[PDB]
Design a protein around this ligand. Structure first.
Ligand code: NA
Ligand code: NA
Ligand code: NA
Ligand code: NA
Ligand code: NA
Ligand code: NA
Lengths: 220, 214, 220, 214, 214, 220
């Protein structure tokens, strides 16, 4: 990665085995649970497209997913080559070339070319652009790998309400709805899908009750 | 974070530490001090990273979102944004402090600017307020229900008592004031008699020494 | 904490998650065994009163004890306010205020005010003063939490003497006697409380025998 | 390694990391990317250290030696050594790149010299070529033999399929081209019918969504 | 410690390391070299920290106190303190080296002063002398009692033999001199005959090769 | 150890508890398996003779071996004193003495004297010289501790060929033959010692077949 710490200077450094090992373990244990993505984002801060490839490529298993993730990266590379066509010309001595889709994705560029683009002024953040493509790819996978439809999350007859809500908002997180639409499934589905005893208690509350108020209500 | 030595990337060890604490301890009161100590010098981005890498307890994390919205709203009411002075940068809105609508660059901007605009420490304050509500919610038993068993060591009973109290968060005036009242009333019969016999102004040392024997 | 390492300069740094995790584990495992206190002292070298509060406040459980520890800190704060009364006056531009009991204890001061006092010349070591109060508090707890009275430590009829001595001096450590009074319980209690066979052997040694000599003697 | 900040000793943590990965994973394809990432800026000495601290898989490590010999021979054929210019150092032979006949001093010499002679990165290339052969060898089942079971989730079947393929190393043209052919032909009957019914231009998403239901 | 790079606080990892070694290994001889290596550049405060964070083995730690007192007494006898030169600091008494009556400031003073007064390394010497006594004490079996079993591999027997010897601390002249004598006399009958048949000037290699077969 | 990292400067540093703990564990677990030696070499890069002694001396157990290793170090010290006789003379102010066998081995020198020799120009690499002696010593032990003779490694009747080869070349590694003589035991012993079914397949290959080709051949 590249972050500014060598005094005032901003020097490149080798991806940390601890960062790698961290990312591989999270993927092994958690299997594209939604929280994996924020973890990916946080382990890959200031990551070069090489670094990103290292993290993705050291995942053994979930290869179905990693293939899907390749397909997505290709789609976002194609769309980039359509939007930014390279005007083929000999490189002026003081400049470097414009990066193609495949160059951002780290497939056709060198670490030198990648450090070039990111540390150039104005910046060409090939790291952060490729990251954007990957994350878009993971989101699709997370939505895919979410086991149950939100419709199917129903509070059991003996199940604590706090447990039911915990599943409900977990499911929702995976089946990625914007936190406007998550806040709007609150006063609708969550109630409709509660068990009979606790549904009655939640209807009796009236509208516009907070999540605190609903969970306090069904505590028994 | 932003650290004064000789910005830095949030440490995988810090993340892993915070995620584990949340996994194991489940909004036990001691979680919050841990949050505060793992998030020293944290940018609002960093804070979001820590909160967002918690899988599970999503009920709670939703509640914590609701609280952050309330503290953002109250900020936009108190500071309504009205043209950028050449040497300065823009004024941060509720959503900008909370890291939702700002960049890491804008956040580093505000904290390292003179005079300082500590968007890190302000958002932290909002989060902690949010966790407190959750901790109070997740506390299993009411202080009223903590009663010393007939064979239960007094030291064990007090340990539950003041744990419960910590969760059902009471001011250190009201914690000090439940001592000479409830703790005694809720002790077992043998040890209650011993604690009444002590008279009023008795320390916790003196009470626990007293009921060591029974 | 603050220790001098940024070249010759002496810079403040964030309390290390590893230091915290270390201290919390020791408290979890060892439960105010005497060795906990030296560990506390060694994990809190150069600690600001904020840092100290962090370490104490991240202990969940032993809350009975942590309440007791609060009571003690209040007693040492009161005694400080009696000894150093603040003369209410507007702060001269080049100075800072005098710290009250509650300011040392980190309850009413900021990290800025704390760094102020410690790095000021002459030094006002609010870190080291609060530490002194805490440790006094833990000592009381350790003495409290010591399970058996030294009187009750008696060598069993089949128990190796080296085992008996190990309990004996452990108990003594908890029931904190000065290492003059620990050295003086040697040639008295330790012998009186040994089993019959080995007591006879230890009396036969005469006075002024070392611990080595006594333990060599009762090897059988 | 040789690292640009503000030579260094190979980190016990790097060594321990690499040895464990080889112990646990046994030339699974993902081992190689891990090798590449643990050996960033590695001197040919460092590389030998990593390979030589692998106990066991000695069959493989012998094979890996044979390959390194082949790439050393091919180098000595392409660059035959013919007197040392006052400002310069000698030209590296096959055996000198491979770290067998050079010193750490000579290796630091070549890499930090201008123009750079990246003996680290050249030897790495030879090793990786060697591991690829071993990975292809150690892959247990032929892609032909990966068939979706009658009760096996399609997501599970695809996961084996593309794992196998990874080992039996195929170009990302030939990986993309086994998709719309073998993967379908080797699916179970119920899900094959569903995948044929999709028509030709179907993504992996679309295929896996399709067979989620069955 | 005091470390020359480009005082520092004793590392929690150093502490944790030392406490674990004492917990697990129980004054096995190898503990002492470990003590010496974890306490490189240690101030007398640091040393006290390491010794004082050992819970348990308190019998031993008391003995170790007695020894430190003996080496402090012997120091006060050899250096009796007799007015502070303007550029200098006071002369350290037995109790000042042992860290009991000095401050960290006074200790950093003595070690970083010119000429150097290595209070760290002097106290260390006293401690190690103390541990040696304990190790010799805690050694379970007398070298006389180490005898090769009738079915026991010779390599196993020698491993006990030289372990025992290490504890019952013998000079490397007396260790080298118990070789061609006791080790043979205490071998089992079959292998003793083989070792006598070797003649006198035989290495440990030669003896262990000889009894590999039986 | 001493490696050049304090900017351009080359400063001595304390042997890392993690390095020690690493080396002790490897010796505990692996018991002079051949791979131990490369590990020793890699944990002891830039090691002073003191450091080396620390690593060797913190091995508890395998004391038989550590005694043998002492005997070897003495033999290489004697041979050094024969080759470099010290001419007894008063030390010229700008110089230091010539190191004796026992001085290299760290037994009779100080850390100061050792840092002296290594950082002197031209260098006197007492670290790297003692290391050479140790490694020679470990090789003898590894060859000793190798359980079976290469002659005795025979492919079982049901044993996968890849398993048999893995033992074969492991054994060989211990019974240290040069990788010319390891490459020459390939087309001879490995075949002669294969099981009947797979021997026939390997003879049928002709001479000069690679290890790949042989292992591909006996895959069934
Ligand atoms: Na709420
Ligand atoms: Na409350
Ligand atoms: Na081969
Ligand atoms: Na292939
Ligand atoms: Na003694
Ligand atoms: Na002895």
């Amino acid at each position: 990665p590249i972050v500014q710490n060598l005094q005032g200077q901003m020097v490149h450094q080798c991806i940390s085995p601890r960062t790698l090992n961290a990312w591989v373990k999270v993927v092994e244990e958690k299997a594209f649970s939604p929280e994996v993505i924020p973890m990916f984002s946080a382990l890959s801060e200031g990551a070069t497209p090489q670094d990103l490839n290292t993290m993705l490529n050291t995942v053994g298993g979930h290869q179905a997913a990693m293939q899907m993730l390749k397909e997505t990266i290709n789609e976002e590379a194609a769309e980039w080559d359509r939007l930014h066509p390279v005007h083929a010309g000999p490189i002026a001595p003081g400049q470097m070339r414009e990066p193609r889709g495949s160059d951002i994705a780290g497939t056709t560029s060198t670490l030198q070319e990648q450090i070039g683009w990111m540390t150039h002024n104005p910046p060409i953040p090939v790291g952060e652009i490729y990251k954007r493509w990957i994350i878009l790819g993971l989101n699709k996978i997370v939505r895919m790998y979410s086991p149950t439809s939100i419709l199917d999350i129903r509070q059991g007859p003996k199940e604590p309400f706090r447990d039911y809500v915990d599943r409900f908002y977990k499911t929702l997180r995976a089946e990625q709805a914007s936190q406007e639409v998550k806040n709007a499934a609150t006063e609708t589905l969550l109630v409709q899908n509660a068990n009979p005893d606790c549904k009655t208690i939640l209807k009796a509350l009236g509208p516009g009750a907070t999540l605190e108020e609903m969970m306090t209500a069904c505590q028994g």
